[PDB]
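Supplementary Methods S3. Input chains for the assembly prediction are listed below.
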Amino acid sequence: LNAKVRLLREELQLLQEQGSYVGEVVRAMDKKKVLVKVHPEGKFVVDVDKNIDINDVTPNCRVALRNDSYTLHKILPNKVDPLVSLMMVEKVPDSTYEMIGG
Amino acid sequence: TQCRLKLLKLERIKDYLLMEEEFIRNQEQMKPLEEKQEEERSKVDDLRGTPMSVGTLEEIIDDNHAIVSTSVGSEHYVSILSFVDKDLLEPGCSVLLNHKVHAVIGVLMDDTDPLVTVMKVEKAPQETYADIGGLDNQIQEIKESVELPLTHPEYYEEMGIKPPK
Amino acid sequence: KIKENSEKIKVNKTLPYLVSNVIELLDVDPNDQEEDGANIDLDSQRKGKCAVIKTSTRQTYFLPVIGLVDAEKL
Amino acid sequence: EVPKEKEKEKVSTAVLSITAKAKKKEKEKEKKEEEKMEVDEAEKKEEKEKKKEPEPNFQLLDNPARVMPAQLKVLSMTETCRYQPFKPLSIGGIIILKDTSEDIEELVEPVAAHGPKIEEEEQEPEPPEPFEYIDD
Amino acid sequence: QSTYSRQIKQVEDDIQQLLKKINELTGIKESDTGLAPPALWDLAADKQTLQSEQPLQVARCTKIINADSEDPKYIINVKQFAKFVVDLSDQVAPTDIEEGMRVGVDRNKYQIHIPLPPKIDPTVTMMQVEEKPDVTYSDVGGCKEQIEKLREVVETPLLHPERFVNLGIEPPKGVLLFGPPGTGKTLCARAVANRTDACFIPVIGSELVQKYVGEGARMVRELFEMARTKKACLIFFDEIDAIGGARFDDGAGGDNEVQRTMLELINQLDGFDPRGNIKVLMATNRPDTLDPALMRPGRLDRKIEFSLPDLEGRTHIFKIHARSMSVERDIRFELLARLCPNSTGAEIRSVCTEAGMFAIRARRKIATEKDFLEAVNKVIKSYAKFSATPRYMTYN
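Predicted C-alpha cells for the full assembly:
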C-alpha cells in the first residue's frame, strides 16, 4: 500500500505534458532519426528514445508517439492494413458446400 | 590489360587521397578548415532541431530561393540557408527543412509513392526464346528494334543511323 | 490610466493578426441582465457589449467588443 | 587532484596524436616502391593512477578497523597511519618495549595520546618541541 | 594481386572513418556546400532570416486597403485559407509586388519582407520547359524552301527589331504550322529558336487542360502573363488536335475543359490589354478543329504550310541524313529519292534505318546500296497504308 502512494506523488508531475500522437514509420534513416507520418498532423523527421523501445526504428510498424517534439515512444502491437479492413467492413456471407450442393 | 588495372586503382585512390589529405592536415594547421568544418556539420543538427518539416522540391530558382511546398498544406518560399547548395539538388526530390526558420538543411528523403510500384512489373516468362517451335526468323526481325541496340549499341552508332525504337 | 489598459490592446493591434466575420452582435448593457439565483447570487453576465465572431481557421471565438469601434458597421 | 596540473598532461597528449596522425595518413607509399603504407593511423592515450595498496590489509565493514600482523614502525607527531577509531591493538601495536616509552600501564592504549614512562629504558633520543606552546 | 587486394579493403575502410567528412564536404544531407558559390548565397539570406522573412509562408495579395493601423495596409490570404491584415517592410526592398500576385509574408510577424517572383503561380508549367537548346541542321531535314519561309517570320524580327520600326511596319507575331505529321514541325521550331537566340517555351496542349473546370484557366492565364514580363518570349503551343477543339457542350462534361484553355488564351491576347512581349507559334494537324477566333490574324498573321515536301526536297532530306551517318557516298542520293516519292521526312529516315537493319544481320559496319534499294521498295508498297498523311492532309 505504501508503495502505491509513494509512486503516486511522482505521477502527477510526470503526467504534465503537451500530449501524444499516433503515426506509422514509413522508413528510418541511418543517422537515427526516423521519418514517421503522424496520421492527423504532418510527417516529421525526429529521433527515438532508447530508454523505452529500440523496435521503434523498425519500418512498417505502427508506432506510439509522445509529443515533446513528436518523439517516438514504442511500437504499438496492434496493427492494421486496409486490405484486412475491406474484408471486415463488408462482412461477406460465407457458406459451405451444401448450399451450392445438389 | 595491365595499364587498365593500374589506372583504376589510381582513380579510386585519388578521390580518397585528396579529400582526406586536406582535412586532417588542416586540423594541424592553425587557420584553414580545422575545427570549423567539423563544427559546421554539428551546427546543422542543432539549428534544425527536432521536429523537421518535410517538403518536396518542385524547382530551384536562381535568386537565392527555391519553391518547396511544406507538409502543412501551405506553400513556402525557402532560402538557401543552414549551409546548403542550390545547384547540387536535382528536381523532384523530397528535402528536409528546419521548421524554426525555413531552410533546406539537405536531401535524403524520397518518401516513396505507390505509382512507381504499379509500373515496374519485372519479367520471368512462361516460355521464352529457344523453347518456342518454328518460324525462327520471325522472332529475329523483332530483335532488330528491341533486342539488338541493347545487346550491342555499337553497330548502330557506328553505322550512324537513328537508333530503332 | 487609459494608456496602461490600451497597451495590451496595442500588442494585439500589431502584427500578427487575423481577419474574421461577425456571426451575431449582442450589444447588451453593462447594467444588470438579471439577478442570478442559486448558491451565491450576483450576476454572471457582467459582460458588456459582446460579439460572437467566427475565425476563418474553422473555430468560433467569443469576444467582448470595445465601445470605440463604431457599432453601426458591426 | 588539482585541475590545472592534469590539464597540462591532456593537452600534451592530444598534440602528439593529432600532429603525427595528420602526416602519417596523407603520405603515399603503398603505390610507391617504398611501401610503408599509404595510411598509418596514430592514437596515444593517457592513464591516471588508481588507489594504492602497498602490502595487504584486512578490510571488514566500511572499516572501523583495518590491520595486518606484519608490523612497521611509525613516528609520533607523524601519524601518517591515519587510524580508524576503535583499534587499540594497532596503536603501540600490542604494547611497546622496543622503544624508550615502556608500558607500565598495560593495554590502555587509546588511539589518541599515549605517553607512558620514558625512564624505564632508553633505546632512542627524544627532542622536546616548544611548538604547541607557540601556536597557543 | 596482393597489392590491389590490399588497396581495395583499405580505401573502403577509409570511407567508413571518413563518413563524418562525406556528409559535410560532398553533400547528400547535412551541408550540401562546397563554399565557393554557397558562401555568397548563404550570406545574403542571413540578414533576411534575422528580422522577419524566414519562415516565409507563401500568400497572395487579395486587396490594398488603408484601414486599421498604418496608411499602407494590405489584406493577404495565406495558402492555409485565412486572411491576415499585414504591414509592409522597407527593412529589405519589395521588388515584385502587384495585386493578385503571390507575395511573401512571415509566420512570426505577418508583414511583407519580399514578394515572390512574377507569376510563379504555376510552378508546374515552368519546370518542364527547355531553354533554347542547340539542334544541328544535319538532322533538320532538307535544305528546302519550306524551312526558309518560317524563319522570316520567327527569327528576323526578334534577331533585329531595328528594321521593322524604321519602315514603320508592325513586327511578326504569328505563324501557323499546319500539314500532316513527320514533316518536322516540332523539329524546325526548336532549331530556329536557338538560331535566333531568344527564349524557348515549349508547352504541351494536354498539360493546359487539367481535371477541374477553370483550373485550365489558371495555368494558361498565368503562362501568358509570365511570358510578357520576361525579355523576349516565344511560346510554342505544341500539337493541339482535339485539345484545341471548337466550342460545344454535351451535358456530361462537354468540350468545356478543352475550350477553357482556348478561351483563356483569347481573353488575355486581344483583351482590353493587347498581346505583350509574346510571340506565338501554333502546331496543328487539324485546322478543321479550331475556333474561328484563333484562325483570324493578330496571333496568326501569316499561314505557311509545312507539309510533305516536293520531289527535289526529298533528295535534300537524303543528303542531310547521310552527313549524320558514316555510310558510303558512292550510294546515289538521288536514286533513293526517285525510288520513294510521296514520302514524308520520317519515312526517309526509316529507309536509312532499315538499310542498317539488313546490314547488322549480314554483319557489316557499313550500309550498302543493295540494302538501300530494298528498303525503298518495301517503304513505297507497305508503309503507305499505315501513313498519317491521307486523313491529316484532308483536314489541312
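Chain C has one helix and three strands. The CA atoms of residues 31 and 46 of chain C lie 8 Å apart.
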